[PDB]
Amino acid sequence: APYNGNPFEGVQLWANNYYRSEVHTLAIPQITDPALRAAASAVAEVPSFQWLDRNVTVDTLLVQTLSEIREANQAGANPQYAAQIVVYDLPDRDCAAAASNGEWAIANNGVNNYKAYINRIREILISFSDVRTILVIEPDSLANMVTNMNVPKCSGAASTYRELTIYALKQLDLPHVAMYMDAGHAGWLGWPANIQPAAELFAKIYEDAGKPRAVRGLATNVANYNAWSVSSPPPYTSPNPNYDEKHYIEAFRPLLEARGFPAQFIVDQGRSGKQPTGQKEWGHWCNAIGTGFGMRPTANTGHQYVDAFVWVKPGGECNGTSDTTAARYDYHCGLEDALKPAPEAGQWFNEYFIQLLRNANPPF
Template structure:
């Protein structure tokens, strides 16, 4: 579970256009009557870019400087080069020849007097990339002058939003579209269907804070998020992922820091991240962090007192550096007034058994009260990070029985108390409250790769002839075993990111960017600290963690976090809901 980067940012330009116009034919629906009215419009348009030489993102901000609300807006402009639209967000974008059009969507098409609506898009180009020289709003042209070549660096005059956390950061907010991932997705056949979706930014090593191999660093992403926000409530999602002795039970996602290097984790990783997030320039963003995937659950299930234990996990449990590190991250990041910390809790096929459930809740509480942290530094949990468990199983439940025998006794469920991520996340959230966490904590579910669509997806419950036949025929999750986690064959894009989809669930999110490998299919020499895990080898016949089953992994996979085109194409093909 790692991140790679795309081409570097090169230049940024800005152009401001002021216009006053009368759109005599501008019509908007008013209630059920269909009545239309004419409206006088006065506006300012700001255009900025983030350019890396072969492509760029463009952000537009349409400000209504009139005295009445602007009930709808359509912005058009022309390029003089060969710029080509690849995807867009926060507006309906299209291109015909050199003319680009952006239309306001449901949540931002109405702009109150003095307010601003923002939108962004990504383009490819070669040669020159001159900014547009004029704009049209609702069919009337207005011209303006070129602004500064870079955004102003002075802190905003508005006071920071420190200490003003909302119950659910996703409600009423836009979410950051990572232009690096978006460019990779859009370059794939059919990739434009999802390339405008928001995904998380993985800070998987110290170098990622400033940017790896010329790619975007943390400040670059936050600057881009501010532009995409255009003054509206806006979430940017970060994965904090560089603990000492990282992923003690999985070689593919091992990290750069040794088991004892907790001081480096604090001073070279967490402290610099916190310093960037404290910048007043980012005070109006809602910064959502996923804290250290897979770490704390490993201390419950993968130490030597379990059949699946490893010496590496014994070491991390004994030295306490997972607990210390997570507590330190919660404390330092939680002190930033606009950061929302979500603790990773594994997934239902890992923590859903009775002997793991409460033990994991207890160890999360231990970490949340270590290194100066308190439970107030935790806004929620995240389930299924970079995993494949179905969000919901529509055709069977944990309460079903066949010939009087509970489905819990089936080979697939194997005495687990949950059959999907949503029921698990809701129940685990309640368990955390019972051990001392705040009653208002929410939950996120990573739905980036758990759709399980395609021809293999059932459309109804199977016949209740045999127990295993009923469960296997009814389940949408088509993995060979619940313990399989690496580049799974047959997986598909899951539910699209969505705020407040169910009780206790803050959002469905795409934390693992679709198309990024879980690990290499064979050993690959690298300087990223990533080993070779046989669970990523399609020929591997398994171990105790997956019931000695085949791994179910795709062949020819690159290192964890590197782009895996074949996986991306499979995810598109098997998406559910279908794309």
């Protein structure tokens, strides 16, 4: 069915069974304290995004989630549940990363692989047109074209990232869908030297895709820990005047809008509840200590430019291993402010889950 305006308005957000199963089968059995078990059970009911970060998730997780939401809605959910899904499988993924977990390479048929992945997602979304579906498109992709074109892999991937982003925007432009392109965070694209080039890039992509109706705007702070709005700049933000996501968005939107793209935003807060964090530097993204579950997902943001506060990266799922010998080890995950020992990226990291519960704000 079609919708008008903010896709988060007028629906509930489904809390998926993948994350609920992680909490109930992996986390809770390891927790003996009654109050922490109860808190854990409660966080399993908070609706976070489900990531299609490997191709195998399309005909498994995506289908299962949409099928379960259809079932709940046909069984009388009021208001209807909507799905929250991340598209995250560009070839030569994470071009500036020390190590990437992306499965596809441009050199090994990656373009064709990705187009087929988008095409299959389109077929599934059409099948489930009755389930309003909100997408984040490709974390850690086009933000690299703003600041990392000195990296050979990024310069070599740039035309592919652009073309395949436009392909996704057009192929997934369906009446029951909303899309938000990743736009980094205040401490990446919100620095004053980066913010106008970022606006130019995203507004051009928007133009070149034909300004598809389904595109609502941009997602920020995905998998990061930034505040929405705090009174004091955290120490690791200095000297950026855009030290939180509100500052970033309020500076970024007018630039985007003058360039043709009046973007609305969604802001990850899933690991933002404690401010400042235990990061020693802003760019320390991996398994950062001193973080908490943050404000619960809602359409009732109170801010004109923000369609929703969301939980994009699901807290407790590891960002990367701390085993320095592992094939895809990323040194960020070995830093002093990264919790250890940490398992492979995407595996449950129970100590980290417990940290997030202890520091939750609002508490569970």
